[PDB]
């Protein structure tokens, strides 16, 4: 009854769709789109004297900043490295009342953040979250989905890198290589700060979401072996960060390490 609808209905919305794209990719559609772009640039030039007033420039200096990267957006690799070297050039230039009163007492997150503050006297939640959003997570995810092992050699620990190498060995036996892109990453945030050992090693937990496409190409012919150019799929990533007390003078890593990497 109702279960037979989804086979019949979903095709009928599709058959009228491409004709609509045939409507959109026609000469009238292309002419209207190009005239809309031309009059959009015309309106941009007409309201450019409105935008070039210095009071609007001052209020845009008040409003606009890098916090737009909070709301999404993907960074190209050349722009990401330019931002990294720009920041390097800038820097180098019975509920008892005691349970109620223990709100100011020391917790385990206080121990973790005190340890990471003792290691470096510039660490804070906002500064590390900014550095995590702008450099670390796009680099890790792009090197993850593009199959580059030299970038992931420095960041991962022994166990997730060994798991990733055993994963890529089968694809090497599959005579295919991985291609893909990362379209947008949003919600890069620190979930919780725990101690995960009997030895009390401090760790941090990072979560994010992204839009990705996974496909595999033949290294000889180049045809599609898996995946599709359409079907943009959404994923979430959960990482566990920690810091080495040594090798903090090593750049391009800054002493950080990833223990576990879970894709959901």
């Amino acid at each position, epitope marked *: 009854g109702s279960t037979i609808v989804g086979k019949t209905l979903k095709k009928t919305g599709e058959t009228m769709e491409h004709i609509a794209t045939k409507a959109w990719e026609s000469e009238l559609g292309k002419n209207t789109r190009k005239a809309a772009a031309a009059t959009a640039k015309k309106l941009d030039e007409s309201f450019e004297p409105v935008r070039q007033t210095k009071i609007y420039k001052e209020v845009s200096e008040v409003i606009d900043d890098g916090e737009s990267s909070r709301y999404g957006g993907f960074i190209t690799k050349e722009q990401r490295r330019l931002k990294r070297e720009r920041d390097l050039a800038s820097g180098k230039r019975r509920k008892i009342t005691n349970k109620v009163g223990g709100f100011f007492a*020391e*917790t385990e997150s206080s121990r973790v953040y005190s340890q990471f503050k003792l290691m470096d006297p510039t660490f804070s939640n906002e500064s590390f979250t900014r550095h995590l959003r702008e450099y670390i997570v796009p680099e890790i995810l792009e090197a993850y989905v593009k199959g580059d092992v030299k970038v992931l050699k420095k960041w991962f620990s022994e166990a997730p890198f060994n798991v990733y190498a055993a994963q890529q060995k089968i694809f090497k036996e599959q005579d295919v290589y991985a291609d893909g892109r990362i379209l947008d990453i949003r919600g890069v945030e620190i979930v919780s700060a725990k*101690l995960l050992a009997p*030895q009390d*090693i401090p760790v941090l937990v990072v979560g994010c979401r992204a839009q990705e496409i996974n496909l595999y190409r033949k290294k000889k012919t180049g045809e599609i072996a898996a995946g599709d150019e359409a079907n943009i799929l959404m994923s979430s990533y959960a990482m566990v960060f920690t810091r080495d007390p040594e090798q903090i003078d090593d750049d391009e890593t800054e002493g950080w*390490k990833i223990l576990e990497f879970v894709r959901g």
Partner: antibody
Amino acid sequence: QVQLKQSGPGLVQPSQSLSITCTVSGFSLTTYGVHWVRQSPGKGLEWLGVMWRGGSTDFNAAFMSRLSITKDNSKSQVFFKMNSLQADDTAIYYCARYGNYDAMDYWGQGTSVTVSS
Amino acid sequence: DIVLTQSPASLAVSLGQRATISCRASESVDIYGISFMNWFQQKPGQPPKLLIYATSNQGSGVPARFSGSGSGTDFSLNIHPMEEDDTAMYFCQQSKEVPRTFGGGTKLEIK
């Protein structure tokens, strides 16, 4: 500030029970643990047992037969109990707090336990 | 489990000179790229005091003239200026496996 103190039971008879109380101050026993370490002069330091952060306990394999470690968060106390004492256990007994990376930073006064008659 | 060994069982140095203590392990105490070995100092009538934890971090309030390094199975502790009140007994303690254990002992005096 952070300070640990101990009881003083000593000069006990052989094959008797020993009970030591470590009273902590400056922290809470549910967010820090306690190691128990003895130091005999003839056998060096050795490790008896721990009470973890999570509330579980652990002991050494050679002393698992007679060790007992319990806690009390309300009175901020840790109790140590050895059921049997012999002449080879004349030593000094310490309780120590362990913090980050399992480091025994803050140590108690330590009690001198002697076995004789 | 992990039997440790301290090399200079008897050591005597002059004032202001560098003293080096070597601690060796049976196996590797490395976990997640970090070595879990700590250093302890005991005065003749005191409980022991922590000096170095996780082989590269100073203890709380410890002066900077105590340093520690090494990895794998071999670790070392260095005091480059020798002061007259640093006459004690020194231990190294591992913190990886469940049967925790301590080193032998090192006597350090001044000629």
